[PDB]
Design a protein around this nucleic acid. Structure first.
Length: 128
RNA sequence: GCUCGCUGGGGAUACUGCGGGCCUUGGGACCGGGAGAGGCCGGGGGUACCCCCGGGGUAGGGGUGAAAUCCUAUAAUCCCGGG
């Protein structure tokens, strides 16, 4: 068939967003970009704007490297942490769409525990 | 009348006590088909989390209302193959 398809792993949280493009197997990295080096203040890294910028940069790198199609994999921290993706997940996906990348299957691979470890914060939780 | 009562006799047998007899309603015993995170012992699993090694890859990661401490160039966050 001769089409180079990859996988875009999106790590979305309430503090930062990471976009990482890799080959079909996932063992070879193509482009890794996040909001930390795109924005300046720590409060704007998880912003959808920073998500769009980082996803766009990763898309340009992948296109120059010779990637046309990609399968999305959204991921929240999961485990004992939050189970909900951050604001910069759909923004990153649509930025990848805008940059000129074909999008195949879209899935959430957040690690869900089957009554695993104890979450942080104590029994009373955070009281701010 | 009071000394809250004691004592010698006679009568009663509904009730209570005592002795005997006859029952099953309360409660126990037993059989039948089922229900349940009731308890103990043994054997096989679920992802998740943490660590270690081998590859990919650069400069960030984390965290907050905002920051900082902290981890990171001895190759971090993140992805993959394994223990």
């Amino acid at each position: 068939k001769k089409e180079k398809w990859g996988i875009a792993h999106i790590y979305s949280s309430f503090n930062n967003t990471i976009i990482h493009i890799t080959d079909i197997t996932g063992a070879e990295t193509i482009s890794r970009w996040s909001g930390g080096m795109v924005v300046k203040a720590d409060r704007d890294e998880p912003s959808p704007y920073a998500a769009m910028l980082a996803a766009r940069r990763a898309a340009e790198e992948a296109l120059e490297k010779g990637i046309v199609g990609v399968h999305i994999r959204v991921r929240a921290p999961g485990g004992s942490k939050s189970k909900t993706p951050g604001p910069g997940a759909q923004a990153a996906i649509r930025a990848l769409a805008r940059a000129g990348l074909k999008i195949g299957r879209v899935e959430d691979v957040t690690p869900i525990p089957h009554d695993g470890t104890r979450p942080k914060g104590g029994r009373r939780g955070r009281r701010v």
